[PDB]
From a paper:
The (−)RNA genome of these viruses is condensed by a viral nucleoprotein (N) into a helical nucleocapsid, that associates with the polymerase complex and serves as the template for RNA replication and transcription. For non-segmented (−)RNA viruses of the Rhabdoviridae and Paramyxoviridae, N is assisted by the viral phosphoprotein (P). P binds to nascent RNA-free N, forming a N0-P complex (the superscript 0 denotes the absence of RNA) that prevents the polymerization of N and the non-specific encapsidation of host cell RNAs. These processes are independent of each other and, therefore, P has to fulfill two chaperone activities; blocking both RNA binding and self-assembly of N. P is a modular protein comprising a long N-terminal disordered region and two folded domains, a central oligomerization domain and a C-terminal nucleocapsid-binding domain, separated by a flexible linker.
In this study, we report the reconstitution of complexes between a recombinant N of VSV lacking the 21 N-terminal residues, NΔ21, and either full-length P dimer or a peptide encompassing the N0-binding MoRE of P, named here P60, that comprises the first 60 amino acids of P, a two-amino acid linker and a C-terminal His6-tag. The structure was solved at a resolution of 3.0 Å by molecular replacement using the structure of an N protomer derived from the N-RNA complex. The complex contained no RNA, but instead, in each protomer, residues 6 to 35 of P60 were visible in a groove formed by residues of the hinge region of N (aa 200–300) at the junction between NNTD and NCTD. Upon binding to NΔ21, the second fluctuating helix is stabilized and extends from amino acids 17 to 31. The MoRE of VSV P (aa 6–35) binds to the central hinge region of N mainly through hydrophobic interactions. The amphipathic α-helix of P, together with residues 14 to 16, inserts into a hydrophobic groove of N. Tyr14 perfectly fits into a small hydrophobic pocket. In addition, the complex is stabilized by three intermolecular salt bridges. Concomitantly, the other extremity of the MoRE (aa 6–13) docks in a shallow groove on the backside of the N protomer which, in the multimeric N-RNA complex, is occupied by the NNT-arm of the adjacent Ni−1 protomer and whose bottom is made up of the NCT-loop of the Ni+1 protomer. N, the N-terminal part of the MoRE of P will compete with the NNT-arm of a neighboring N molecule and therefore interferes with the polymerization of N in the absence of RNA. 0-P60 complex, the negative pole of P localizes in the RNA binding groove, while the positive pole docks on the backside of NCTD, modifying the distribution of electrostatic potentials on these surfaces of N and suggesting that electrostatics could play a role in orientating P before binding.
Residue numbers in the entry:
A (entry chain N): 6 to 35
B (entry chain O): 5 to 33
C (entry chain Q): 5 to 34
D (entry chain D), E (entry chain E), F (entry chain C): 19 to 422
Write the structure that this text describes.
Amino acid sequence: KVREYLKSYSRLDQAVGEIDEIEAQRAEKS
Amino acid sequence: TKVREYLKSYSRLDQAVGEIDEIEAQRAE
Amino acid sequence: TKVREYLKSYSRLDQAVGEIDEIEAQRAEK
Amino acid sequence: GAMEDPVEYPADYFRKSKEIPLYINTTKSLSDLRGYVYQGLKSGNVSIIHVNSYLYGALKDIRGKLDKDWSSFGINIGKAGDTIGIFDLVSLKALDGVLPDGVSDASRTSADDKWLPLYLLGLYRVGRTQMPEYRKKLMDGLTNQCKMINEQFEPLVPEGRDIFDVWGNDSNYTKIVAAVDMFFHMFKKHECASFRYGTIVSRFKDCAALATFGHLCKITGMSTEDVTTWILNREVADEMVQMMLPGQEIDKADSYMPYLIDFGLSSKSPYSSVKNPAFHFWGQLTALLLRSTRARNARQPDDIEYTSLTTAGLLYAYAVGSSADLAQQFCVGDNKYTPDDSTGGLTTNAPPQGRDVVEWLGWFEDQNRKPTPDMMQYAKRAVMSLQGLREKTIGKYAKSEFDK
Amino acid sequence: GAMEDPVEYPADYFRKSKEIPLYINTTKSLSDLRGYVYQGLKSGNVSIIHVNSYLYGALKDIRGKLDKDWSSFGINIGKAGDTIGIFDLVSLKALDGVLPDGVSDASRTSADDKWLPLYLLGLYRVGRTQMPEYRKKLMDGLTNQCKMINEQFEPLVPEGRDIFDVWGNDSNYTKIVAAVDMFFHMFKKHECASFRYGTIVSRFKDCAALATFGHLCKITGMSTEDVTTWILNREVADEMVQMMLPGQEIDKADSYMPYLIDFGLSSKSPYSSVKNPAFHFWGQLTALLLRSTRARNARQPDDIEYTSLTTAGLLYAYAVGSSADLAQQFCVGDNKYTPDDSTGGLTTNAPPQGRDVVEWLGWFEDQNRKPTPDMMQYAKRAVMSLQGLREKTIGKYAKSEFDK
Amino acid sequence: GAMEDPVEYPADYFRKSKEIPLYINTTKSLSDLRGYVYQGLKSGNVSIIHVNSYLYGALKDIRGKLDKDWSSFGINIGKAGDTIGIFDLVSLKALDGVLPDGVSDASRTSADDKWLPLYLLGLYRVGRTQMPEYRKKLMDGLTNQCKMINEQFEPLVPEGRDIFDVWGNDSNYTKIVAAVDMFFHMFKKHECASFRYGTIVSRFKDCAALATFGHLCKITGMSTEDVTTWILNREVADEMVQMMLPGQEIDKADSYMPYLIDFGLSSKSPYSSVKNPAFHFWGQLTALLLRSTRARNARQPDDIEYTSLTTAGLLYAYAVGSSADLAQQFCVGDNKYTPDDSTGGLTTNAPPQGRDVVEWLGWFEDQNRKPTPDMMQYAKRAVMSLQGLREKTIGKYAKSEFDK
C-alpha cells in the first residue's frame, strides 16, 4: 500500500542482528 | 434504531479512552 | 540458491577433521 | 438513575461554584508540623489535619511556567506565560484548634521535606489496595522511590498500617492528591514529577466504564464510533448516551474532569462500572473472548440482562475473530496485492467478510437468531485454558457459560 | 503517543544542545575517594557522589588512538589520528559539597584502581537483574573478572545488596556507564576493554523492538526489507515507520544512539517494546512458532489486537515453515540441480512454493481467510512440548491458543 | 563478522610478527620456585607468576631430535636433524615486580620436578569443566597419572579448587600449555609425553565446527567433498567457505594452527561453533538422526533458521538412512555379486538408490517439498527412546520436534 524505503539505513540488516545479540545477554533465567 | 451516531463534542475521544485504560491497567492486583 | 564449487586446497582434510573430532570427544562432560 | 443513583456531571458543579475549596486548617509553621508527621508515622498514629497541613506547607513550590493557556469548565487557571503553584488549582483556608501528639525536633528543615511529601501522597495508593501481597509491592516501590530522593529512607510507619487507609475518606486529603496529580500532569518534566507515584490512582478514579470503552477499542482494533455501532442491547445504548453527554471535557487531558471524585465535583460518577453495568459486563466479556489478559478478573455486575448481553458479546467477538482484516502494508514497487476477492463464500451460511454490524445482523437472522456450533466452539476454545478464575468475575462466568 | 508517550528521538536532542553534561561533584583527590569507596562498599553503604567522583578520577586515561574519524549527530568527537579519553564523549564539572562516610587509609594507589572501577561498573549489570538465582551468575562472573586482575579478589559488598540497585537511577552514574561502553566499543582491543563487563547492558537499552526486528530476521532467514513486506496489520506498520524514521543513526555502530536512555538523550524511547507493542507481539509470536528458544519468555503486551495479530503471525510462520527453500550450494562439477518442474500444485488448494507475501495473500483468499486445519496443526505442533511457561508471556499465550 | 566478532585467521598473525612472545617471570632459581609452587598449592594460594616461572625452569628439557623439517606459517622451528626444546616454539622473557608467598625448602631439587609440571599443567584441563562430577574424574586421572611417576603422590591443592580456574585467563600460562602439547605431538615417544594429560585440550580449542564437520563425515561415512554437496542452506555454505579459506594449515598435523587461542594468534576463531552456528546446528542434528551418541548434548545455537536447517538435515539423514549402499567386499572365487539387475523402482514416490544430492533434490521436489509421512517416521524412531536431555541442546530440540 505504501512504498518501501531504505530510509538512510543501508547497514540496517547487520545492525539489527547485533542488537539481538546484546538483548540475548540480558535474558534472565532460573 | 433509538438514535444515529453523533460525534459528541469529544473529537479526541479515541486517544483519550486508551489513556484511561492505561491508568486502569495500573490498578490490577 | 545458485551454485559454486571448488576442490579444497587442503586434501589431507578428511584425515584432519576426523582427528579434530577425536580431541573434541575428550572434552565432553558427564 | 432514580433514588441515590442520580449521576452528577462535573460540568454541573461549576455552574454552582467557581472554586474548589481546600480547607487547610491551622498555621503551626512547617518546622513544627514536620516533627508531628515524622514521629506520628514512626509511632503509628498521626492526625490527618497535621498531615494535610504539612503537605500544604511543603508543596508550595510556585514553580512551573505555563506553556499555553489553561482553562477547564470556564475556570481560567492560567494564561500563556504565567507561573502557577499546585494550590492555584484550588483555593481557601479555615484555621482552628488542634490535637497534641509525638514530635521529633531532630528533623531537618530542607532534608525531610524533599522525600516526605512523596511518602505521604504515596500512602494514598497503598492504603487503597486490599490484598496484602500487592500492598507490599507498592510499599517497596514507594520505598524505592524515596531512596531516589535518597538518604537511605526506611518506611516510617510500622506493620500496623491502617492509619493511612482512612486518609482517602478525608475530603481535604483527596483534594491535595488531585491537585498534585493535575499539576504534574501539566508539568511532566518537573523535578518533583516523581510525586505522581501515589496520586496517579486519583486520575479517572471510578471511571471504569470509560476505561472499559477504551479497552474494547484497543483489543478489537476498532474506533470508538465503530465499537458504538456494535451495541445490540438498548440498556447498553442508554448507558452509552449517559457516558457521551456533551460539555464534560472527557477527551480533554488538561481538565478537572478526571478528578470528579477526589476534588468533590461529583457524588455519583456517570462513568463508573456500577453505573454502566450492562456496558461493563458486555464490553469486558467481548474483550475476554478476544484474548484479554485483564478482562478475566473484571467484576460481574448485578441485576443485568445476562443472556442478551452474552449473545451480543459472542456475535461481536465472533465477528472480530473470524474477520482478521489482513492487508498488505509494504511492497517492493510494482508487486502489489489487490483483493479481487469475489466477496462471496458458502451461500447464506458463509459469515460476512468484514465487520459491518448490518451484514452480521442479517447473517444472524438467517441463522434463526441462534449462536451456531462454530460460534459456540469459538467461545469454548477462548474460555478453556483459563486457570485460577475468581468467583463472581466475568472470567469465571465465561468459562461456566461456554466450557461445555 | 499523545500524552506521556510522545517519543523523543536521539537526533532531536542534538538540535537543542551540543554537549552531554556530566555533573562530577567536589573532585577532591583520588586517594581519599578510593578510601571512601573501598570501605564504603565493604561497610554496606556508599554515597553515589563518591562512586561518581572516584569513577571519573580513575578513568581519566587519555588512551586509544583513532585511525578513523569520530562523529555522531554533528558532534565531532575526534579527527584523524587523535588520542582521546573516555570523557571526551561528555562535558562539565559541578562541585557541591560532600558528606562523611567510612574510610580506609590502608587502601593502595597501585593494587586498587586496576580492578575497582571494573567492580563498581559491574554492579550496574548485577543491580538491573531481579531473579536472585541469575543475579549470582553475573556476580560470580564479576568476581572472576576482578580476580583476573590479581589480588585473589573477594567481593567487597556484603549480601545487603540494596545499595547498588538504586545506582541505576543516578543521572551521572549511567553517563559514565555509557561513556565507558561507547569508548571501549571504539577501542575493543584496549587494555581496559574488560571494563565493559557491566556496561554492555547500557548499549541498546530499552530498544527491544529493534532487537525483536533482528531476532525475526534471523529466525526467518530473511532481509529487513522482506520481513517488512510480510507485515499485514496497520498498527504494526505504523509502529514500523516510527522505528524507521531517517537520521537517527540506528545502523551506525559508532554512535550515541544506542545509549539514548543512559545518556539522557531520550525520555521515551522510540524503539522500546512498550512503544511498539503490536510489532513486539507479532514479531515474537511468529519467531516462537518458528522454533525460538527465547521468544517463549517474551512479555505479552497489553491493549493490542491479539486475535488479528495472531492470524498474521500464523500465516507468516506457516509460509516460512512450509517453504524451506532448499537448493544446491556445491556440486562435483556438471551434476547440477535446476528446479521448476511442474511448480503447479493441487489445483486451487496447494500453498505457494516461495515466500512471496502477495501469493500467500492470494492463497489465503481461497481458504476463505480462515486458518487451514494444516495451519492449526503446524502451530499446535510448535506450542506443545513447551514446559515451564510463565503467566503473561508469548509462550503461555501461544500454547493456550493452539494447543486446544 | 561486521562488528566486534570479525574472524581472525592463524596465517594473518605471522604476517605482522615472527614471534610468539612468552613473558617469563623474574629469574629466582629453580629450587626457590619449587618451594613457592609446592607450598602455595597445598596451602591454597599460589601466584601464576610463580607457577609460570617454575614451569619454565622445570620444562627446559632440550631433548627432542628432529627427524624431518619443522615449518608452520614461514617460521622454521627446525631443520634436518637438530635437537630442540619446548621453548623453541616461543620467545622472550619479561620482568616486573615479585610478591611474597609461603615456601617449603624440604622439597627435593629433583624428585618433585618429575611429576609437578604434569600436575600444574594438568590442572588446566580440570579448570575447564563446570560439572563437579566429571571435574572429579579428571582430578582422579591426574592423581593416577602422577602416581605412575611417584608412588606416594597425594593431591596437593585442597577442596577449594577455585584457585587454578583463573590460570586459563593468563596469557603466558596458556602459552606454556600450547608449547608443551605441540612439542610432544611431535615427540610422541618422549619420556615426558605423559605431560599431555592436561595440555591436550589446548589443541583445536574453539575449533568446534571443524570437529562437527569431522563428526558428520565419520557418522555418514562420506568424504568431506560429498558432505559439502549435501549443504542445502546458503548460510551454512557461507560458513563453510569461512572455514575452508586457503593457507591456514588446518590439515597440517604439526602446525601452530591447532593452538590458535592459547598462542594468541587469533581472538576470534573462524572454526568455532559460535561463528559457524548454522553448520553446527544442521551438522549436529543430521548426526543425531543418524545415531550419534554425542550429538544429543551439543549446544543449540541462537538466531538461526531452525525450520530450514531442520528440513535440510532430515532429507540428508533420511538419504543416508535409506541408502545403506551394501556391496560385496570379499568373494570366494568366481561367485560374485553384480548389482546391475534393478536400477529403478516404483513411482515418482520411491526414494533414490544412491546418495546423490541432485537425485534427492529432484525427488524432494516431486514430494511437494514437504517431508513425507515415512520421512517423518524415520526421525520419530530416531529421537524417541532418548532419555534425560538438557535444555537448549540439539537432542532436546530433535525430540521435541520429531516425537509426535
